[PDB]
Amino acid sequence: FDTINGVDHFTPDKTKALGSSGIVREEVFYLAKKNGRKFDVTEGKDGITVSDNKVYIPKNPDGSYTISKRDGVTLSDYYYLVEDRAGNVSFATLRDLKAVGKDKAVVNFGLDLPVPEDKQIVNFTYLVRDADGKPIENLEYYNNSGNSLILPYGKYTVELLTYDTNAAKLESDKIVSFTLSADNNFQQVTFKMTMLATSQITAHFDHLLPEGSRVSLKTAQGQLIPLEQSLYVPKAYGKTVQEGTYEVVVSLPPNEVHELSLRLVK
Amino acid sequence: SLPPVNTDIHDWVKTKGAWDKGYKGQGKVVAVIDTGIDPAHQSMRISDVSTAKVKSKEDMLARQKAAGINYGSWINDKVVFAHNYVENSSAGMHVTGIVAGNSKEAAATGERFLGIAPEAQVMFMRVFANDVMGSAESLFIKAIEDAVALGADVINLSLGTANGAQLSGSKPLMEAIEKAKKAGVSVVVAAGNERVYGSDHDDPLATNPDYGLVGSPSTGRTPTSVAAINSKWVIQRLMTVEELEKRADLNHGKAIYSESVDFKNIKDSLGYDKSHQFAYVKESTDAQDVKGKIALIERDPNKYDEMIALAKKHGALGVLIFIPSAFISHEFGKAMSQLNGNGTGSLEFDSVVSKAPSQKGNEMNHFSNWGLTSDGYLKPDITAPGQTGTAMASPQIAGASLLVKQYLEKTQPNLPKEKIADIVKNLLMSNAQIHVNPETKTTTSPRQQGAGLLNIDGAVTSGLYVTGKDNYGSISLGNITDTMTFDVTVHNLSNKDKTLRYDTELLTDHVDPQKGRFTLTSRSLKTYQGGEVTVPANGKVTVRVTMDVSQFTKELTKQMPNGYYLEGFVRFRDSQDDQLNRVNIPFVGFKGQFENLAVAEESIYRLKSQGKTGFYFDESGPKDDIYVGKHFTGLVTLGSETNVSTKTISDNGLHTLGTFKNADGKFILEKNAQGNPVLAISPNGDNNQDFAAFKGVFLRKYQGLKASVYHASD
Ligand SMILES: [Ca+2]
Ligand SMILES: [Ca+2]
């Protein structure tokens, strides 16, 4: 964000497209008011249609965009918008992208999970530490998300404090290092995770076992998990819950009727 | 030369019997895991550090190096370790005061407050949840492990989830607790403060008896799950009226008053005034009024001081009716005498606290969590005096556990670490005093009070404790059938054998007959005399309890058609002296099939077709309104109007499938010419009634819910 004469000149970073999250289209535009709202309803020939009151700021030769200060319009009314090759779009107010000073950088934290968008753990917490060690203080957030910090140039380290351990498992390193500098001024660090899914497994013997029988499960490897006899249906042993595919062994530290019920989606 | 000791709880829980034997927590350690302390308070002190477990900051540093713990620090001889586990930039000071407060100075009331274990040292882990509870689980586990490592003797855990299961909790937490047990560490946890299914609406209906809500992890086998009784005494700012200093049935004219949501609150120690207008409407007033007219909480014209409509209820209800512009109120025996003396007289509100007898004294706390585990086990384990109910009972049992663990370490020196913590729990439960509900004059259900109110003396004096088949201070039978039998085992820890006579009191739930709802009071069906057994010194003996409940199956099944609880206590006394060696063990079973109770509430359509109604369903508007926002089991679909002069661009949102908008604009469950509603959908794409999805009122925890469609021929 710089000025020439009376400037107001926003030049977006280069969108390094080449891909499926590569950017095909970008626009700067401001949202004019009319009748009180930032949209209007035009009665077309076929029926009714609705649209934001966009007015586009042309891309100058210089690569920049000229934010002429004008009217009753403000920097919280200007938007920079991007559409990637798969057709997701993202917008931001030019005020929020301007809120990061020129001497500062942006780091962004997130979970890489192999599932779609809405079936994702959206909640977790982290801690950011110095070149020396101390936690980061006076947190400045970026574009209205709590996982994008604005920090001065330097070397830093971030730690995954907490997340939903009853919903997923950490698959990558818990403390990752990142460095913000004048050219590398936007880093994204992610913690890859794998989704956890659970089953209710139950071994239902046809006849009562002899007292103190030990009923157990044999995992993928030679591991064994102990099952506890239910208090309400004494024939029904299958107690435990962890999920993945098993076979049943009864020690005394001989039927079957084995049932696992896919149970999940909290 | 020291001020006297406040014994409001000590006299009831019988701590003196433990102190007078040498058990004050010397060289023991309680780890409070909670939201915040102040290690500098007048009460964070110990007498004689030479006997403490941790004798110096250097000792503490040593342990931290040994255990591999590079954070937190020793603070004083009392708080020997403290740390923040939520480190990224008081409530639990009371709990610490209660376990281990040892003050030389006196408090506001003139007396000095001593915790249960005044000579214990303390460790403080700041841990709590912020957005999605369960994310905090990892910090809690780090806390438990550090308490264990740096050498705690008891852990007071502040953590709850509502309707916990005993055998099927959260794997890493339950395991870290198991390691804590294997290190000899009692783990004490509040039961919870949600009380029963539907506590914010009405009492549970008699067809739905799985109403328990005890919370995880107190529902684990290992932790001690503490329910809460209301203290007999309160310490708070009273309100005086001097023309009444003579009528002692009114604490000598000092009232307990309350308020709700802070309208324009009090202006202390100034002889204000008011007279009595009990005609609630338009009297010649010159501005105390009886809220006898239960109409609406609207305070009077300018000067309030309302009083109770129900003689002796002494609820002093929160929410001031029976915005601002005055102040709150609400007591009664002071009202119907304050209204004497000519019509009116002068009062003032005190600025220094006083002791005064409690209005809810000796009654189970309304919010203390109740009922079984989600998967059928008997919790909570025990009661102590205490939305911060159970949370203030919990440290009482943590301190008691310190004292009893001391007893065990002296008189059973070779009892192994892997087996002491359970003995501490079992002695506490077996020696508790069974409560009686002073209102209904009948025994409180073990689903509410556990093995009874704490009794520290009994636990460190009798050598007895009691046990069931599963080797635990209480008995979870399971399904019951017309004939209940179980085997009780008594253990003796003294070196002189004792002889005990034992009977069996049997209880079920009391049910309100005109409303078809439990009353959350118990009903004593019968006491079954059971004989006599002699417990060998340093041994055990087993007797069998057998009961025939056949006589009751008609009436109980009729008032509770899906099964009822049969529960109660096996009570042992000394054979020659009725008051020695009082021990007992609670049991509960279910006459029916608990594991099969209905999971979802009946469908709203079926219910309407029997003239019945749901448990949360508002019968508000027109006849057979089922507004999608109400609470019912039914199907929901999405509607959109057919517009003849435009393309529609707007859906109408969800509505109850089977209901249709009427003249006034309300969705009514319309009936076809045969009399019935009609569930039907049209997947044409028009986005009008194109799908059907399930909406439930769930009576029980569930899993594996899914929807399927079959042909009706099938
Ligand atoms: Ca205990
Ligand atoms: Ca349709």
Taking the C-alpha atoms of B31, B33, B39 and B44 in order, what is their torsion angle to the nearest 10 degrees? -40
With breaks defined as C to next N over 2.5 Å, after which residues does chain A break? 253
From the number of C-beta atoms within 10 Å of its C-beta (0-12, 13-18, 19+), residue A120 rates as middle
Q: Which of A98, A80, A97 is nearest to A30 (CA)?
A: A80
The string of DSSP letters for A219-243 reads -SSS-EEEE---SSSTTB-------
Nearest to B141 by CA among B113, B177, B97: B177
Residue A9, marked binder: no
Residue-number span of the structural domain to which A14 is assigned: 1-101
Question: B351 CA to middle of ligand 2, Å?
Answer: 69
* Long-range contacts from A115-118, C-beta under 8 angstroms, 24+ separation: A115/A195
Cβ of residue A146 closer than 8 Å to a chain B Cβ:
no
CA–CA distance, B644 with B641 (Å, rounded to integer):
10
3-state secondary structure of B175: helix
Residue B302 CA to residue B633 CA, distance in Å, equals 49
Chain B residues in contact with A239 by the CB 8 A cut-off are: 167-168
Interhelix angle B137-150/B171-182, nearest 10 degrees? 10
User: B702 contacts in A (CB within 8 Å)?
Assistant: none
CA–CA distance, B265 with B256 (Å, rounded to integer) = 15
The verdict on A130 and A186 lying in the same domain is yes
The angle at the Cα of A74, spanning A71 to A80, to the nearest 5 degrees, equals 120
Is the CB of residue B376 less than 8 Å from the CB of residue A231?
Answer: yes
Resolution (Å units): 3.1
- The radius of gyration of chain B's CA atoms, rounded to the nearest angstrom, is 29
Q: Please, what is the Cα angle at B589 between A252 and A251, to 5 degrees?
A: 5
Residue A263 contacts residue B168 (beta carbons within 8 Å): no
E strand or H helix at B555, and its extent?
Answer: helix B553-559
SS3 B72: coil
Q: Do A230 and B139 make contact, defined as CB atoms within 8 angstroms?
A: no
Three-point CA angle B366, B368, B372, nearest 5°: 120
Q: Which of B118, B190, B119, B188 is nearest to B154 (CA)?
A: B188
> Is-contact B331 B231, C-beta < 8 A?
no
Phi/psi of residue B676, each to 5°?
-100, 155
Q: What is the DSSP letter of B469?
A: T
- The H or E element spanning position B169 is none
Nearest to B550 by CA among B528, B522, B531, B519: B528
Q: Which of A42, A126, A149, A161 to mutate: most B Cβ within 10 Å? A: A161
Residues of B in contact with A48 (CB under 8 A): 646-647, 649
Residue B593 with chain A: CB contacts under 8 Å = 232
**One domain, residues A237 and A203:** yes
Q: How far apart are CA B356 and CA B234, in angstroms?
A: 6
Contact list in B for residue A232 (CB cut-off 8 A) is 376, 478-479, 593-595
Do residues B315 and B329 touch, judged by C-beta distance below 8 A? no
Same domain, A81 and A119: no
Beta bridge partners of B465: B491
Question: Quick one: B192 exposed, middle or buried, by C-beta within 10 A (0-12, 13-18, 19+)?
Answer: buried
- Quote the ligand 2 centre to B650 CA distance (angstroms): 14
Do residues B451 and B474 lie in contact, with contact meaning Cβ atoms separated by under 8 Å?
A: yes
Q: Are strands B634-638 and B654-656 parallel, antiparallel or unpaired?
A: antiparallel
Q: CB of A11 within 8 Å of any CB in chain B?
A: no
Interacting residues of B606 by C-beta distance below 8 A, sequence separation 6+: none
The number of beta carbons lying within 10 Å of the beta carbon of residue B371 is: 25
Do B425 and B186 touch, CB atoms closer than 8 A?
yes
In terms of domains, do A211 and A232 share one? yes
For B135, which of A46, A124, A232 is closest by C-beta distance?
A124
Residue numbers of A between 107 and 126 with CB closer than 8 Å to B:
123-126
Residue that is last in its domain, among A101, A128, A161? A101
User: Nearest residue of B to residue A262 by CA position?
Assistant: B704
- For A222, A225, B272, B337, the CA distances from B342, given in Å and listed in that order, are 89, 79, 17, 11
Q: Does the N-terminal peptide bond of residue B357 adopt cis geometry, omega within 30 degrees of 0?
A: no
DSSP B181-234: HHTT-EEEEE--S--STTTTT-PPBTT--------TTTTSSSSEEEEEE--SEE
Distance of residue B424 Cα from the nearest chain A Cα, in angstroms: 25
The angle that helices B417-430 and B390-411 make with each other, rounded to 10 degrees, is 120
Strand partners, B667: B661
A204 annotated ligand binder: yes
Distances (CA, A) of B304 to B262, B321, B692: 14, 11, 54
Nearest alpha-carbon partner for B378 in B589, B222, B201: B589
Q: Compute φ and ψ for A224, nearest 5 degrees.
A: -130, 130
CA of B660 to the centre of ligand 2 (A): 14
The number of distinct structural domains making up chain A is 3
Q: Within 10 Å of residue B287's Cβ, how many Cβ atoms?
A: 16
Please provide residue B155's backbone torsions phi and psi, each rounded to the nearest 5 degrees.
-120, 125
The position carrying tokens 């059973």 is: B412
Residue from the list B172, B476, B704 with its beta carbon closest to the beta carbon of A261: B704
Yes or no: say if A163 and A123 are a contact pair by the CB < 8 Å rule. yes
Give B580's contacts (C-beta < 8 A, 6+ positions apart). B462, B573, B574
Ligand 1 mean position to B522 CA, how many Å? Answer: 27
At A66, give phi and psi (nearest 5°).
-90, 105
Rounded to whole angstroms, the Cα distance separating B90 from B72 reads 19
Asked whether residue A189 falls in the same domain as residue A165, the answer is: yes
Cis peptide before B217 (omega within 30 of 0): yes
Q: A161-196 burial by CB neighbour count: b if 16+ within 10 A, else e? A: bbbbbebbeeeeeeebebebeeeebebebebebeee
Distance of alpha carbon B105 from alpha carbon B353, whole angstroms: 17
Question: In DSSP terms, which residues pair with A145 in a beta bridge?
Answer: A142
Chain centroid, CA B454 distance in Å: 15
CA B662 to ligand 2 center in whole angstroms: 19
Of residues A127, A163, A241, nearest to B135 (C-beta): A163
Kindly state the tokens that stand for B322. Answer: 């029976």
* DSSP character string of B473-520: SSEEEEEE-SEEEEEEEEEE-SSS-EEEEEEEEEEEEEEETTTTEEEE
The closest of B344, B219, B330 to B277, measured between CA atoms, is B344
Other CB atoms closer than 10 Å to residue B54's CB: what's the count? Answer: 22
Last residue of a domain, one of A178, A197, A216: A197
- The strand order across the sheet containing A141-142 reads A141-142, A145-152, A104-112, A186-195, A168-170
Structure tokens at A159: 């730690």
Q: In this complex, is the C-beta atom of A50 within 8 Å of any C-beta atom belonging to chain B?
A: yes
- Do A82 and A115 lie in one domain? The reply is no
**Residue B458: partners with Cβ closer than 8 Å, 6 or more residues away:** B14, B17, B431, B432, B433, B582, B583
DSSP string, B233-302: EEEE--EEEGGGTT-GGGTTTEE----SS-SS----SS--EEE---STTT------EETTS-S-----S-
Count of all residues that appear for chain B in the document: 714
Shared domain check, A130 and A113:
yes
A51 and A144: one domain? no
Q: Which residue do the tokens 């780091």 mark?
A: A107
Is the distance from CB of B385 to CB of B98 less than 8 angstroms? no
- Provide the 8-state DSSP code for A146: E
Using CA atoms, how far apart are residues B227 and B213, in angstroms rounded to an integer?
12
Residue where a domain terminates, one of A197, A219, A247 = A197
